[PDB]
Design a protein around this motif. Structure first.
Motif, PDB file in Angstrom:
ATOM      1  N   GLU A 188      40.919 -91.347   6.742  1.00 49.25           N
ATOM      2  CA  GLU A 188      39.674 -90.743   5.990  1.00 49.25           C
ATOM      3  C   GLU A 188      38.651 -91.876   5.949  1.00 49.25           C
ATOM      4  O   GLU A 188      37.301 -91.141   5.845  1.00 49.25           O
ATOM      5  CB  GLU A 188      40.520 -90.088   4.737  1.00 49.25           C
ATOM      6  N   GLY A 189      38.680 -93.036   5.624  1.00 47.85           N
ATOM      7  CA  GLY A 189      37.626 -93.822   5.303  1.00 47.85           C
ATOM      8  C   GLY A 189      37.635 -93.867   3.869  1.00 47.85           C
ATOM      9  O   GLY A 189      37.081 -94.980   3.073  1.00 47.85           O
ATOM     10  N   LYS A 190      38.015 -92.844   3.282  1.00 46.46           N
ATOM     11  CA  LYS A 190      37.918 -92.526   1.591  1.00 46.46           C
ATOM     12  C   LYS A 190      39.363 -92.715   0.920  1.00 46.46           C
ATOM     13  O   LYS A 190      40.179 -92.355   1.788  1.00 46.46           O
ATOM     14  CB  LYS A 190      36.976 -91.942   1.011  1.00 46.46           C
ATOM     15  N   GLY A 191      39.334 -92.675  -0.226  1.00 47.65           N
ATOM     16  CA  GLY A 191      40.855 -92.657  -0.878  1.00 47.65           C
ATOM     17  C   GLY A 191      40.711 -93.178  -2.293  1.00 47.65           C
ATOM     18  O   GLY A 191      39.800 -93.397  -2.800  1.00 47.65           O
ATOM     19  N   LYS A 192      41.946 -93.299  -2.808  1.00 48.50           N
ATOM     20  CA  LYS A 192      42.189 -93.665  -4.247  1.00 48.50           C
ATOM     21  C   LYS A 192      43.253 -94.738  -4.467  1.00 48.50           C
ATOM     22  O   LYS A 192      44.081 -94.351  -3.693  1.00 48.50           O
ATOM     23  CB  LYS A 192      42.273 -92.398  -5.183  1.00 48.50           C
TER      24      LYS A 192
ATOM     25  N   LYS B 287      39.202-102.781   9.362  1.00 49.47           N
ATOM     26  CA  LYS B 287      40.689-102.491   9.469  1.00 49.47           C
ATOM     27  C   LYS B 287      40.700-100.824   9.996  1.00 49.47           C
ATOM     28  O   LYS B 287      41.792-100.270  10.373  1.00 49.47           O
ATOM     29  CB  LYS B 287      40.985-102.239   7.749  1.00 49.47           C
ATOM     30  N   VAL B 288      39.538-100.390  10.141  1.00 48.77           N
ATOM     31  CA  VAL B 288      39.326 -99.030  10.661  1.00 48.77           C
ATOM     32  C   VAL B 288      39.355 -99.129  12.322  1.00 48.77           C
ATOM     33  O   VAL B 288      39.661 -98.185  12.961  1.00 48.77           O
ATOM     34  CB  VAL B 288      38.206 -98.077  10.122  1.00 48.77           C
ATOM     35  N   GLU B 289      38.875-100.134  12.632  1.00 51.47           N
ATOM     36  CA  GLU B 289      38.612-100.252  14.176  1.00 51.47           C
ATOM     37  C   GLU B 289      40.152-100.723  14.484  1.00 51.47           C
ATOM     38  O   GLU B 289      40.501-100.044  15.782  1.00 51.47           O
ATOM     39  CB  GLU B 289      37.855-101.465  14.551  1.00 51.47           C
ATOM     40  N   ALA B 290      40.827-101.492  13.904  1.00 51.32           N
ATOM     41  CA  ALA B 290      42.180-101.826  14.329  1.00 51.32           C
ATOM     42  C   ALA B 290      43.112-100.616  14.272  1.00 51.32           C
ATOM     43  O   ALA B 290      43.863-100.585  15.089  1.00 51.32           O
ATOM     44  CB  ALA B 290      42.672-103.134  13.316  1.00 51.32           C
TER      45      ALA B 290
ATOM     46  N   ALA C 236      38.988 -80.756  12.805  1.00 53.99           N
ATOM     47  CA  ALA C 236      37.804 -81.192  13.678  1.00 53.99           C
ATOM     48  C   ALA C 236      36.491 -81.282  13.014  1.00 53.99           C
ATOM     49  O   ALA C 236      35.424 -81.731  13.711  1.00 53.99           O
ATOM     50  CB  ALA C 236      37.884 -80.254  14.860  1.00 53.99           C
ATOM     51  N   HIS C 237      36.401 -80.735  11.427  1.00 55.46           N
ATOM     52  CA  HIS C 237      35.030 -80.803  10.929  1.00 55.46           C
ATOM     53  C   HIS C 237      35.115 -82.130  10.316  1.00 55.46           C
ATOM     54  O   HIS C 237      33.923 -82.327   9.840  1.00 55.46           O
ATOM     55  CB  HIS C 237      34.984 -79.571  10.102  1.00 55.46           C
ATOM     56  N   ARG C 238      36.246 -82.991  10.435  1.00 55.64           N
ATOM     57  CA  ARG C 238      36.066 -84.052   9.845  1.00 55.64           C
ATOM     58  C   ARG C 238      36.151 -85.273  10.777  1.00 55.64           C
ATOM     59  O   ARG C 238      36.901 -85.209  11.944  1.00 55.64           O
ATOM     60  CB  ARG C 238      37.540 -84.624   9.040  1.00 55.64           C
ATOM     61  N   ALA C 239      35.228 -86.432  10.452  1.00 51.85           N
ATOM     62  CA  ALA C 239      35.023 -87.468  11.511  1.00 51.85           C
ATOM     63  C   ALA C 239      35.961 -88.711  11.076  1.00 51.85           C
ATOM     64  O   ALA C 239      36.001 -89.835  11.140  1.00 51.85           O
ATOM     65  CB  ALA C 239      33.653 -88.062  11.359  1.00 51.85           C
ATOM     66  N   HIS C 240      37.276 -88.106  10.970  1.00 46.53           N
ATOM     67  CA  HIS C 240      38.347 -89.192  10.740  1.00 46.53           C
ATOM     68  C   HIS C 240      38.921 -89.954  11.986  1.00 46.53           C
ATOM     69  O   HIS C 240      38.696 -89.417  13.131  1.00 46.53           O
ATOM     70  CB  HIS C 240      39.558 -88.329   9.896  1.00 46.53           C
ATOM     71  N   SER C 241      39.600 -90.802  11.749  1.00 44.97           N
ATOM     72  CA  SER C 241      40.352 -91.618  12.860  1.00 44.97           C
ATOM     73  C   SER C 241      40.922 -90.951  13.892  1.00 44.97           C
ATOM     74  O   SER C 241      40.436 -90.746  15.123  1.00 44.97           O
ATOM     75  CB  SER C 241      41.070 -92.744  12.360  1.00 44.97           C
TER      76      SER C 241
ATOM     77  N   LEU D 265      31.212 -80.235  15.258  1.00 46.18           N
ATOM     78  CA  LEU D 265      32.884 -80.698  14.814  1.00 46.18           C
ATOM     79  C   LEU D 265      32.851 -82.086  15.435  1.00 46.18           C
ATOM     80  O   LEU D 265      33.360 -81.919  16.604  1.00 46.18           O
ATOM     81  CB  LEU D 265      33.800 -79.589  15.287  1.00 46.18           C
ATOM     82  N   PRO D 266      32.850 -83.096  14.974  1.00 47.94           N
ATOM     83  CA  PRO D 266      33.187 -84.310  15.344  1.00 47.94           C
ATOM     84  C   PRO D 266      34.562 -84.453  16.073  1.00 47.94           C
ATOM     85  O   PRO D 266      34.380 -85.007  17.237  1.00 47.94           O
ATOM     86  CB  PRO D 266      33.356 -85.250  14.165  1.00 47.94           C
ATOM     87  N   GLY D 267      35.533 -83.704  15.809  1.00 48.99           N
ATOM     88  CA  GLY D 267      36.757 -83.602  16.379  1.00 48.99           C
ATOM     89  C   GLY D 267      36.597 -83.168  17.961  1.00 48.99           C
ATOM     90  O   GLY D 267      37.329 -83.654  18.592  1.00 48.99           O
ATOM     91  N   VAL D 268      35.702 -82.244  17.982  1.00 50.74           N
ATOM     92  CA  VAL D 268      35.458 -81.510  19.243  1.00 50.74           C
ATOM     93  C   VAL D 268      34.618 -82.368  20.334  1.00 50.74           C
ATOM     94  O   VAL D 268      34.568 -82.621  21.381  1.00 50.74           O
ATOM     95  CB  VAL D 268      35.368 -80.156  19.272  1.00 50.74           C
ATOM     96  N   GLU D 269      33.479 -82.734  19.558  1.00 52.70           N
ATOM     97  CA  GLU D 269      32.452 -83.650  20.045  1.00 52.70           C
ATOM     98  C   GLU D 269      33.126 -84.917  20.820  1.00 52.70           C
ATOM     99  O   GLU D 269      32.895 -85.232  21.941  1.00 52.70           O
ATOM    100  CB  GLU D 269      31.412 -84.023  19.055  1.00 52.70           C
ATOM    101  N   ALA D 270      34.183 -85.406  20.082  1.00 49.49           N
ATOM    102  CA  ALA D 270      34.771 -86.556  20.465  1.00 49.49           C
ATOM    103  C   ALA D 270      35.605 -86.166  21.941  1.00 49.49           C
ATOM    104  O   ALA D 270      36.088 -87.201  22.718  1.00 49.49           O
ATOM    105  CB  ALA D 270      35.729 -87.130  19.518  1.00 49.49           C
TER     106      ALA D 270
END
Length: 404
Positions: free
Chosen positions: A128-132, A145-148, A168-173, A395-400
């Motif tokens: 996600e890029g974010k978290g707690k 660490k996200v590239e890896a 697909a609306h989320r630009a997650h890994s 949608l980043p998911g479909v764009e990708a």
């Protein structure tokens, strides 16, 4: 448009190891699957992969709410590995992780036919890029660490398939980080795109959109976009009161008030006027004395009003009939949001009756797209992603995905 991104069936899978991103975020209560539909839904894509000689089919998904912190004893996708081998009548190998040295290896060269299931994706902030943290303090994934993360993930398959329309609306890994010659889409995500990308390109006409809600502020971006391609629009839900409380000075006694109903309404209104759109509203409403499925039922009309304390939860019988009319003359309908409180048999009148008018329209040649079984053209499942679309956003998911 829609005919731009590649799909499973359009891929040659002989000897290729498929890395597929799916939706296994199923209802879990104490490491026990309480609803296994999301899993049954994906199977077809997975089966098509094997049926067509795929080498291996690795599966990656997320569950619960780990927040980029591993939680094996809680949000672990292991119960799903079992539930899945069961439903496939085939043994699914489960890995305790989704990235790194050992995971990359075990997926390097699986025995032609092996289905693998990676541990919960969101056990890593990189997803996600974010978290707690383990102490509730928000954290932020390291650009490296996200590239890896996306790098290791990519090593796990020759072709990439995204069959998780709902994320697909989320630009997650797992959504836009896999680096493979082909980023296709599963059958599930395909059908999602097909329908929604017809509602936004060349809708059959008349095209009616039934938009439910409460939050007028958290709907205005949606109504305004739909306003650009719908002939008709039925606005139900509690946001309807903001309109009537304005356009008609109607009194909504108790019925949840809205702050800025003011401007946005007048503003959503004119846009319909310039576009030649007929926006209908509830005329009457079944009123309730307490936000509770067991409340002394009451009734009211606009001219009449929702007395002090009471509140509408479903639309009246005249509103029902009106919908009959609208619905009966559409060739494409997109229903999003609740018309009334349908979980309480007492106030499901409206919602209930509408499904009828719609199932009817469908058996009469109309195309029906319900947000939230083959009595309607299509039922979405990718919640947030659905409206993200309908809201005119991408949608980043479909764009990708890979262009054809």
């Amino acid at each position: 448009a829609l005919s731009a991104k590649l799909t499973l069936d359009k891929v040659d899978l002989k000897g290729k190891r498929v890395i597929m991103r799916v939706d296994f975020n199923v209802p879990m209560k104490n490491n026990q699957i309480t609803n296994n539909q999301r899993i049954k839904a994906a199977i077809p894509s997975i089966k098509h992969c094997l049926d067509n000689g795929a080498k291996s089919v690795v599966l990656m998904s997320h569950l619960g709410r780990p927040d980029g912190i591993p939680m094996p004893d809680k949000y672990s996708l292991e119960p799903v590995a079992d539930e899945l081998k069961s439903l496939l009548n085939k043994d699914v190998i489960f890995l305790k992780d989704c990235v790194g040295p050992e995971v990359e290896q075990a997926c390097a060269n699986p025995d032609n036919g092996s289905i693998i299931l990676l541990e919960n994706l969101r056990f890593h902030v990189e997803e996600e890029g974010k978290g707690k943290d383990s102490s509730g303090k928000k954290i932020s994934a390291d650009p490296a660490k996200v590239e890896a993360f996306r790098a290791s993930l990519s090593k796990l398959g020759d072709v990439y398939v995204n069959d998780a329309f709902g994320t697909a609306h989320r630009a997650h890994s797992s959504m836009v980080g896999v680096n493979l010659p082909q980023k296709a889409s599963g059958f599930l995500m395909k059908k999602e795109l097909d329908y929604f990308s017809k509602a936004l390109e060349k809708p059959e006409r008349p095209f009616l959109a039934i938009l439910g809600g409460a939050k007028v502020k958290d709907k205005i971006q949606l109504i305004k976009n739909m306003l650009d391609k719908v002939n008709f629009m039925i606005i139900g839900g509690g946001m309807a009161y903001t309109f009537l409380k304005e356009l008609k000075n109607m009194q909504i006694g108790a019925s949840l008030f809205d702050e800025e109903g003011a401007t946005i309404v007048k503003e959503i209104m004119e846009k319909a006027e310039k576009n030649g759109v007929k926006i209908v509203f509830p005329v009457d409403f079944v009123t309730g004395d307490k936000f509770d499925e067991n409340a002394k039922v009451g009734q009211a009309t606009i001219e009449s009003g929702i007395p002090s304390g009471w509140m509408g939860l479903d639309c009246g019988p005249e509103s029902i009939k009106i919908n009959a009319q609208i619905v009966a003359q559409a060739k494409l309908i997109v229903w999003n949001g609740p018309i009334g409180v349908f979980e309480w048999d007492a106030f499901a009148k409206g919602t209930k009756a509408l499904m009828d008018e719609v199932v009817k329209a469908t058996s009469n040649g109309c195309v029906t797209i319900i947000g939230g079984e083959d009595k309607v053209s299509h039922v979405s499942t990718g919640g947030g992603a659905s409206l993200e679309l309908l809201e005119g956003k991408i949608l980043p998911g479909v764009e990708a995905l890979s262009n054809m």
